[PDB]
Every structure is written in C-alpha cells, then in structure tokens.
Design an enzyme around this catalytic site. Structure first.
Site: not given
Ligand SMILES: N#Cc1ccc(COc2ccc3cc(S(=O)(=O)N[C@H](CCC(=O)O)C(=O)O)ccc3c2)c(F)c1
Length: 434
Positions: A115, A138, A183
């Site tokens: 993406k 994103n 996820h």
């Molecule tokens: N209230 C509140 C919160 C908000 C955020 C968080 C922790 O932040 C996180 C967790 C997981 C997460 C996952 C994603 S994602 O799924 O869009 N992207 C990750 C990116 C991982 C990485 O950068 O290594 C993935 O694909 O696994 C984006 C932001 C994210 C932020 C809290 F605790 C509490």
C-alpha cells in the site's frame, strides 16, 4: 460538518492525535485528549490550553462527549468505546474528518502489503502530470495535515483501522491490493473480519480496483477494474516482462528502477488508479521509470566487501516477508533477521522458504522464540535486534545477504518500523566495514 460548540474528545495522541488537535482548534473547538499510555508521544507538543487525561480512558469524558475521535491505534472493541457507541455517541477517526472537508478527488489505497509503495507511486504519477497532489494518510503526513484548498488531488494510504472509523469516503479510485493475515491482535473474529474492515474502502468509490489473483480483495457482492499477473484488465506479459492494459503493451519493466513481480503488480495497481483518477498515461508511465523505492522497503543500505545489507524493516507481516523471500537470489548465505511483535500471526507460511543449507535465522523481540521454531536447527534467538546483528556479523562471508525482514511489528522495542530500519542501517554500517 459543523463542530462549533461540541464536546469533542480525541483518543490517542501521537502524530495522528496531534493533527486532530490542530484540526479542531483551527475551527474554534478546544478538544480534550485521552490516552491509555501514561506518557504518549506528542504529549510535550500538546497545546497548554488542551485538557488531557493519560494512563487510562476517562469514562466521564467519553460519556459527556458529543463526538469521539478515535486514533486507529485503539480498538473500537475497547469496552469504554463500545459503551459510548452503545449510548449512540458518534465515533469517527482522522480520515472521516478529512473526507468531510476534502475538496479534491481522493485515490484511496489499502492492503496487507504494497500500500505505501502504490500510494507513493500514484503521488509521483500525479507530480509528473504537474498536478498539485497531497500524499499521505497512514504513510508520510497524517491526512489532516494535507488539507488545502489548493490541492488538486489526494492520494491516501488507509489502514484497516482507519477504514473502521470512516463512512464519508467516496474515492475517485479505491483498491484493496491484497488480504493476508495481519493485525489478528485487533480482529478476534479472524481473517474475514479484517477483510470486512478493508472492504469498506469500496463503498461509494467511483472505480474499484481489485487484485484478480486475490479473491479476498473483491467486494463480497459495474464490476471492478482488476490487475494481476496472468489475468486482469492490467496484467503482465512475460527474459522480459511488460506491463499491459487490455492486451496492449504499455511499459517494458527494464525501464523501472524497482524489480520483482511484486513491484510489477504494484506498478499495475498504481497505473489502474492513476488512469481512473484521469491522470495522463505518459506522465504516469514516466513516474514508473523514475521511482526509486521507499526507505525501509527492501532497501540496500550497504553493499560492501561482497555483502548486501538490506533494510526491509517495513515487512511487518508474514505476506510482506514472503514477498521478500519468494524468488530471492542469494549467492552464499542468507542471514535473515526475524522478530518483534508478531500480532498473533501464524509464521508457518515462512517455513517453505527456509529449507536447505544456506539460510541462517536470527530471531529477536517479543516473539523471537516462535520465529526460531520455524527451523530451530539454523536459528539463533537473542533479545534485541542489535544483539542478533552483533552475533551474525562475524559469520558474514563475501556473497552473503543480511536481510532485516522481520515479519512483525517493531512496537515492542521500537517507536516504529522506521526507527528499527534506521537502527539496522546504523549497525550495518558499523559492522559491515573493517
Ligand atoms: N488511546 C490510545 C492509544 C493509542 C495508541 C497506542 C499504541 O499505539 C499503537 C499500537 C498499534 C498500532 C498499529 C498500527 S498499524 O497497525 O497501522 N501499523 C503497525 C506499524 C508497526 C511498526 O511501525 O512497526 C503494523 O502494521 O503493525 C499503527 C499504530 C499503532 C499504534 C496505545 F497504546 C494507546
């Protein structure tokens, strides 16, 4: 939409949360901000007049809200958010807010892998046409930082989480590139629930673009435009590969700086989107020849002494690491770095790439043990990526590849995959020279 006078609560800071905070202030609304983390990113950047609650969700604030703006990082299934929803309190995310304000067409892109590449490619296509384009979501800038009356087109990467809280997107062209397990820590009803989140992207889209080779990208119920390898409106014709549209040759991929079938189908998806957005072909095809790749996405950070050190830190799921391994040529030994937060993924599909005599695994972070289990005989486990790099560095021979393609999130030990990639590149530079 009109927010004046409303009690607005933003859940989650970091960069997305901050962009939401600015969005509301500029519009005469002072929101409150909460975060389950005691010390969230952005806290020190929060305007001093903004009330904040950290370390938990505040139910008094949530149940008082006229509008809740939930960061994609918090689950709508969180019991406090679930309760607010049951009360009929409106819950949206940053992308919903953006869509209600945006005054240019939006190309919207999601998928488990590819993406960010496709999003960036479509952006470069628009730039080559002299279109004033805002690219982000994103990836890069959060969407609300792109908003501008002068913008002629928006190209947004949208995660499944962002899509869950959006209802007002009506994309000029939308795609789900692929759906592979990811996820699962956030989708307790499994792969189809995750797919359902991504399928929202097609709702009221002018053109849907599907992957002919991935049935999960197709709307459950005109047709969609499709891309694929052997089949598709946009497809490959193949020691030479061409991009084709309805049987017509449009580009010999020797003109692209990206390589591999994965990147060619990314080029196809991006061209389908560009076309549907009404961008000119010439400039779109030109962009395909100039685009160099994104940092952290199979990036050679050092090629020295007969060893290639590749930063694929953006491989945060199994399908992404498969893309790196499938058809991979290594002259000597592959030293493969795996680990971090696996998000309850099944790593088994990786095993079929890990046979034979010239593979070594260096597994770290939260799920290092589970990754070592793929082939314990060629596997080492450490706590950190730095320890694995220092362990592997002496074993590296001319002809070898050292590949960080972790198949996991970095969030157990790092701020984000970019920090992980940057650390790997730093260590590569230290360890890959005498
Ligand atoms: N209230 C509140 C919160 C908000 C955020 C968080 C922790 O932040 C996180 C967790 C997981 C997460 C996952 C994603 S994602 O799924 O869009 N992207 C990750 C990116 C991982 C990485 O950068 O290594 C993935 O694909 O696994 C984006 C932001 C994210 C932020 C809290 F605790 C509490």
């Amino acid at each position: 939409a009109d927010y004046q006078g409303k009690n607005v609560v933003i859940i989650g800071l970091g960069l997305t949360g901050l962009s939401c905070v600015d969005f509301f202030l500029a519009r005469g609304v002072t929101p409150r901000v909460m975060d389950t983390r005691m010390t969230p990113p952005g806290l020190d950047k929060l305007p001093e007049a903004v009330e904040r609650h950290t370390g938990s969700l505040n139910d008094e604030w949530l149940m008082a809200a006229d509008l809740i703006v939930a960061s994609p990082g918090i689950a709508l299934a969180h019991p406090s958010l679930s309760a607010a929803a049951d009360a009929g309190i409106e819950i949206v995310g940053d992308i919903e807010l953006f869509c209600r304000e945006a005054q240019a067409p939006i190309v919207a892109i999601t998928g488990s892998n590819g993406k960010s590449t496709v999003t960036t490619l479509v952006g470069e296509m628009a730039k080559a046409a002299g279109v004033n384009v805002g690219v982000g979501g994103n990836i890069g800038l959060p969407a609300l930082m792109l908003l501008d009356d002068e913008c002629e087109l928006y190209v947004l990467e949208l995660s499944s989480f962002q899509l869950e809280t959006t209802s007002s997107l009506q994309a000029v062209a939308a795609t789900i590139l692929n759906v592979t397990e990811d996820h699962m820590d956030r989708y307790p009803f499994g792969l189809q629930q995750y797919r359902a989140a991504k399928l929202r992207i097609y709702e009221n889209a002018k053109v849907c673009v599907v992957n002919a080779d991935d049935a999960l990208t197709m709307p459950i119920r005109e047709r969609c435009v499709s891309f694929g390898v052997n089949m598709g409106d946009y497809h490959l014709n193949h020691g030479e590969t061409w991009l084709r549209v309805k049987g017509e040759k449009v580009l010999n991929v020797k003109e692209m700086k990206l390589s591999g079938q994965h990147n060619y189908t990314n080029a196809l998806a991006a061209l389908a989107l560009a076309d549907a957005a009404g961008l000119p072909r010439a400039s779109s095809l030109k962009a395909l020849t100039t685009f160099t790749g994104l940092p952290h996405r199979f990036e050679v950070v050092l090629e020295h002494n007969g060893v290639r050190w590749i930063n694929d830190s953006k491989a945060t799921n199994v399908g992404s690491t498969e893309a790196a391994l499938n058809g991979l040529h290594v002259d000597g030994t592959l030293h493969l770095l795996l680990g971090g937060d696996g998000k309850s993924a099944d790593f088994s599909p990786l095993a079929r790439y890990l046979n034979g005599d010239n593979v070594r695994l260096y597994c770290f972070g939260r799920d290092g043990a589970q990754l070592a289990a793929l082939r314990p005989e060629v596997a080492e486990q450490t706590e950190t990526m730095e320890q694995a790099m220092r362990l592997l560095a002496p074993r590296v021979q001319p002809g070898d590849m050292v590949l960080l393609s972790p198949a996991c999130a970095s969030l157990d030990q790092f701020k984000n995959f970019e920090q992980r990639g940057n650390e790997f590149a730093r260590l590569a530079k230290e360890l890959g020279s005498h």
